[PDB]
């Protein structure tokens, strides 16, 4: 026979946005990022972020508490390009970013002129 079930339950589909591209350069290599999913949780249901690297250079280990917060901070970053997807979702909804973070090297002087 033919048991197909269609599943008449389904989650939303929320807008998840980090910002834009971040770029840092050395000696500085702490960047923060903050997740934005709209529409905005009420003052009771509050969703969770879920940050990750899928994207990132043989030369960083990969090291990162994939911001159990909303705000995720990074450290001792090299030169490099790291992107992060904050994967954000609910009971009945689901949502996810991307935000791309390139490192320059430390360039010991100016560069224009």
């Known amino acids: 026979g033919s048991s197909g079930s269609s599943g008449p339950r389904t989650v939303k589909e ?38 990750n690297l899928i994207s990132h250079p043989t030369d960083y280990q990969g090291e990162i508490k994939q911001g159990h917060k909303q705000t995720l901070n990074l450290s001792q970053l090299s030169v490099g390009l790291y992107v992060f997807k904050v994967t954000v979702s609910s009971e009945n909804a689901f949502g996810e970013g991307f935000v791309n973070v390139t490192v320059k090297p430390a360039r010991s002087g100016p560069s224009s002129g």
């Open 14 to 51: 929320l807008t998840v946005s980090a910002g834009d591209n971040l770029i840092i350069t050395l000696p500085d290599n702490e960047v923060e990022l903050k997740a934005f999913v709209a529409p905005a949780p009420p003052v009771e249901t509050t969703y969770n972020y879920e940050w």
